[PDB]
Amino acid sequence: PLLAAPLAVGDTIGFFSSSAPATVTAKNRFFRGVEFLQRKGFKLVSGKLTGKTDFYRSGTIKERAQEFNELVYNPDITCIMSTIGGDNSNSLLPFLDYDAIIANPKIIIGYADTTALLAGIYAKTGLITFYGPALIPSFGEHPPLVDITYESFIKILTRKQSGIYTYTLPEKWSDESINWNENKILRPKKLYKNNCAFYGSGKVEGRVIGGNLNTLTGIWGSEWMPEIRNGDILFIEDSRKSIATVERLFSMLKLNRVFDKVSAIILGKHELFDCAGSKRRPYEVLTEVLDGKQIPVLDGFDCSHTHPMLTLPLGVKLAIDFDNKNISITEQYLSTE
């Protein structure tokens, strides 16, 4: 795979708004996230659509593609970070400068709707991109959870690329929709014990592919959807969906023969899942859809819309040890220097 140079303290991070204009609509949280990273020593470059609005988005399709490309062209930038997702980053894909991305590999990071870009860039260039923090939702989060998000971000992106990396398990997590865009919290979020579950036995190792599942529907079938192959580990997460929608998306995967190929599935914790009174969780729905197909599942990985969020390279090998209840990166995912 094509690898970006690693991050280091003091580096320059550029940020872009490929969909929702949250630098305007969540400006307090945006400023808190900016200050958070600056205090860590990072220099920030603001994408050209910062502070702009076109109703539901930051600008036209072409304006948004230009904003992103301009960060790729900047030789001082080590990391290109999404401000926030939305719905519309898939529109940009025909207009990204893939040749420039290949010539100037950088760490590209975000989540949610930005999956369309992470997956599309990988499909076109082979660059290992990252499912991880976006500036506003992730780094504008109030303590204590933001510190745990940051610890994973800095560990994954700055560590020496020698030997496997085994993920830590956050002690507590939350998905509450409070404390969004004001100076002070209303009240502390509920902190849940980590209820991640490992369904299966033994160890499965394979290339991880995926992201936000609902977002993948916007690139599915196209040259921008990475081909899923025998032995891959599928990583999928969704946010604020009804159980009805979750069944639909799992059945989409089934119809596409994905469950005939993959050797394991990672479900990210689902933010504020709506079970419609059934008390069912997503894993139970997946089990029905699987129709007897035995695939081991890591249910509740902390790489999703819940807080805190771990950073995950996409398109490299992971090993899930179902017996020891852990998950590791086993393939180099950044340049050694």
Ligand X SMILES: N[C@@H](CCC(=O)O)C(=O)NS(=O)(=O)OC[C@H]1O[C@@H](n2cnc3c(=O)[nH]cnc32)[C@H](O)[C@@H]1O
Residue numbers of the site for ligand X (CB under 6 A)?
Answer: 20, 84-86, 112-113, 137, 177, 180, 212, 214-215, 238-239, 271, 305
The SS3 assignment for 92 reads helix
Q: Which amino acid is at 296?
A: P
- Shorter beta-carbon distance to ligand X: residue 100 or 255: 255
* Residue from 7, 77, 136, 219 in contact with a copy of itself (CB under 8 A): 219
Q: Which is nearer to ligand X, 152 or 215 (CB)?
A: 215
- The interaxial angle of helices 243-255 and 282-290, nearest 10 deg, is 30
Q: Specify the residue, 20 or 156, whose C-beta has the smaller distance to a copy of itself.
A: 20
Select the binding partner of residue 315 from a copy of itself, ligand X, none (C-beta < 5 to 8 A, by kind): none
Q: Which of 278, 324, 335, 336 binds a copy of itself (CB under 8 A)?
A: 278
Q: How many CB atoms lie within 10 A of CB 255?
A: 10
Q: Which of 186, 159, 192, 187 is nearest to 174 (CA)?
A: 192
- Binding marks (x or -) toward a copy of itself, 26..55, rule CB under 8 A? ----------------------------xx
* Residue 112 interacts with which of a copy of itself, ligand X, none, CB < 5 to 8 Å by class: ligand X
Residue matched to tokens 């509920």: 190
212 binds, among ligand X, a copy of itself, none (CB under 5 to 8 A by kind): ligand X
247 binds a copy of itself (CB under 8 A): yes
Q: Does 220 bind a copy of itself (CB under 8 A)?
A: yes
**Residue 277 interacting entry, from ligand X, a copy of itself, none, C-beta within 5 to 8 Å by type:** a copy of itself
Q: From ligand X, a copy of itself, none, which one binds at residue 251 (CB under 5 to 8 Å depending on kind)?
A: a copy of itself
Q: 213: which residues sit within 8 A by CB, 6+ positions away?
A: 236, 237, 238, 249, 253
Residue closer to a copy of itself (CB basis): 172 or 240: 240
245 binds a copy of itself (CB under 8 A): yes
In this structure, how many other beta carbons lie within 10 angstroms of the beta carbon of residue 46? Answer: 16
Q: Specify the DSSP class assigned to residue 139.
A: H
Q: Cβ of residue 141: shortest distance to ligand X, in angstroms?
A: 10
DSSP 43-64: EEEE-TTTT--BTTBSS-HHHH
**What is residue 205's three-state secondary structure?**
strand
Answer for which of 35, 99, 223, 323 binds a copy of itself (CB under 8 A) is: 223
- Rounded to the nearest 10 degrees, how much is the dihedral formed by the CA atoms of 96, 98, 103, 109? 70
Q: Residue 18 interacts with a copy of itself (CB under 8 A)?
A: no
Q: Which does 218 bind (CB under 5 to 8 A by kind): ligand X, a copy of itself, none?
A: a copy of itself
> Stretches 42-50, 204-212, 254-262, 324-332: which one binds a copy of itself (CB under 8 A)?
254-262
| Residue 127, φ and ψ in degrees, nearest 5 | -65, 130
Cα(114)–Cα(120) distance, integer angstroms: 10
| DSSP element (H, E) containing 36 | helix 27-39
Q: Which residues of 265-297 are buried (b: 16+ CB within 10 A; e: fewer)?
A: bbbbbbbebeeeeeebbbeebbbebbeeeebbb
Our finding on whether 315 is near a copy of itself (CB under 8 A) is no
For residue 264, state whether it binds a copy of itself (rule: CB under 8 A): no
At 266, list the tokens. Answer: 């990672």
Q: Which stretch binds a copy of itself (CB under 8 A): 64-72, 147-155, 188-196, 274-282?
A: 274-282
Binding site for a copy of itself (CB under 8 A): 19-20, 54-57, 60-61, 86-88, 90-91, 93-94, 217-225, 242-245, 247-249, 251-252, 254-257, 275-278, 280, 288-289, 291
